[PDB]
């Protein structure tokens, strides 16, 4: 499989970093040379130019690529551009940065595959949890479905999930307890809730928002 | 409960923008007085500032507050000097967007108490899903373990869990199903595994490594 990343900034440079972790090879690419230096013995071709010249990403041989991550940041219009010229070039899977919901609409209907928004997604769960402290994290499983990190509290500890009867009478479902540096996997009926658990909930964010009502 | 953002790029705009829509106040502060006027209806306080300067953090009255974040990010510097003030005036909860490494662990030796890493942590999920496809994302439980979203492939595909077995051969866990737009919790050993389902699945980060190589 061929892998490309455009634009080595804290996003771009990531990946590029992940992949040579992961053992894969890499093309990067940047205009900035001093950027393209610093990932010269990590990518495995580090390329110095710019994407929005056509012949430069054809010339590369970027045609048919397995994946292409599109990483540039302020340079909405070299974003958009870039991603229709890996388009026309037939790149399997393209993934972009988004800077914001114009971006986003626009890359869109220029047929990114993946539009990704690490700041804005990250910054949501942590916005979650400060607003709810016994909520630790969460996840989105689907648009109706969430995995949510909850801190047990003196109301929940001291109790057997027997007698919490929690999916019966909330409709979420316990399905990990991280207890300590353990975790205790699908526990059993039985098991009973210690002071500072941070149980892994399943539900749906209807049913986990009136959970959090009742109990946190 | 008092909060406020320090610094309104995507990641520090991004949390304004949550914390107004999770319906609490926040004061959100930039030096550059067009990023303030964007958040001026969202935040319930938007102050044009700089953040180093030490009595201004205290004449706005961030002594003892909640949580403050610090998002500014090209400015190590500035950064850091920042977050030694916020300590220094008894904040309770500080979270700064680190920049490298070297930024973290300067960060950590002053006092701040959440550092995060919103590129690099979706770059890392990005990368992995693109080296292994049935492998969609995962999240971090513990040191020792993960939740991970698996494809299932033609071997799982037609099986039930029972026959699958796969808690006493690779001691993980399907802890839930993505099928279709529904997801079912913790299913039954009689379950039969459908193409397409997503395995919503927890073990140790070795025995799903094992689990991927023998079956993926
Ligand atoms: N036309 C182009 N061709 C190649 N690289 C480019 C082009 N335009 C910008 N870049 C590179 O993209 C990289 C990222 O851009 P920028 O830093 O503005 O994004 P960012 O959102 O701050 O990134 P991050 O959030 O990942 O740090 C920069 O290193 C820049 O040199
Ligand atoms: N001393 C300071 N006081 C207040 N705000 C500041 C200070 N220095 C920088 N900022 C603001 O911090 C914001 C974010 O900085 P910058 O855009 O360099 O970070 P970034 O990593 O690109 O952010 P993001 O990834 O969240 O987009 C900018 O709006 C900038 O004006
Ligand atoms: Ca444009
Ligand atoms: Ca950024
Ligand atoms: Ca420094």
Same mark, same amino acid.
């Given at each position: 499989?061929?892998?490309?990343?455009?634009?080595?900034?804290?996003?771009?440079?990531?990946?590029?970093?992940?992949?040579? $972790?992961?053992?894969?090879?890499?093309? +990067?690419?940047?205009?900035?040379?001093?950027? %393209?230096?610093?990932?010269?013995?990590?990518?495995?071709?580090?390329?110095?130019?710019?994407?929005? /010249?056509?012949?430069?990403?054809?010339?590369?041989?970027?045609?048919?690529? /397995?994946?292409?991550? %599109?990483? #540039?940041?302020?340079?909405?219009?070299?974003?958009?551009?870039?991603?229709? #010229?890996?388009?026309?070039?037939?790149?399997?899977?393209?993934? %972009?940065?988004?800077?914001?919901?114009?971006?986003?609409?626009?890359?869109?209907?220029?047929?990114?595959?993946?539009?990704?928004?690490?700041?804005?997604?990250? +910054?949501?769960?942590? +916005?979650?949890?400060?607003?709810?402290?016994?909520?630790? /994290?969460?996840? $989105?499983?689907?648009?109706?479905?969430?995995?949510?990190?909850?801190?047990?509290?003196?109301?929940?500890?001291?109790?057997?999930?027997?007698?919490?009867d929690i999916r019966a009478k909330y409709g979420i479902?316990?399905?990990?307890?991280?207890?300590?540096?353990?975790?205790?996997?699908?526990?059993?009926?039985? $098991?009973?809730?210690?002071? $500072?658990?941070?149980?892994?909930?399943?539900?749906?964010?209807?049913?986990?928002?009136?959970?959090?009502?009742?109990?946190?």
């Open positions: 499989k061929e892998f490309a990343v455009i634009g080595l900034g804290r996003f771009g440079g990531s990946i590029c970093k992940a992949l040579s $972790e992961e053992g894969v090879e890499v093309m +990067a690419m940047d205009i900035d040379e001093d950027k %393209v230096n610093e990932y010269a013995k990590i990518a495995s071709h580090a390329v110095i130019g710019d994407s929005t /010249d056509e012949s430069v990403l054809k010339n590369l041989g970027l045609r048919n690529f /397995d994946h292409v991550i %599109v990483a #540039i940041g302020e340079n909405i219009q070299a974003s958009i551009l870039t991603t229709l #010229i890996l388009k026309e070039l037939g790149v399997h899977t393209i993934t %972009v940065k988004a800077q914001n919901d114009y971006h986003e609409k626009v890359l869109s209907k220029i047929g990114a595959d993946h539009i990704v928004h690490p700041e804005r997604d990250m +910054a949501k769960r942590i +916005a979650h949890n400060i607003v709810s402290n016994n909520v630790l /994290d969460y996840l $989105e499983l689907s648009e109706e479905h969430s995995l949510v990190e909850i801190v047990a509290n003196s109301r929940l500890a001291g109790n057997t999930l027997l007698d919490l479902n316990i399905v990990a307890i991280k207890r300590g540096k353990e975790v205790i996997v699908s526990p059993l009926a039985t $098991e009973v809730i210690h002071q $500072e658990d941070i149980l892994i909930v399943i539900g749906s964010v209807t049913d986990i928002s009136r959970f959090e009502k009742r109990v946190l």
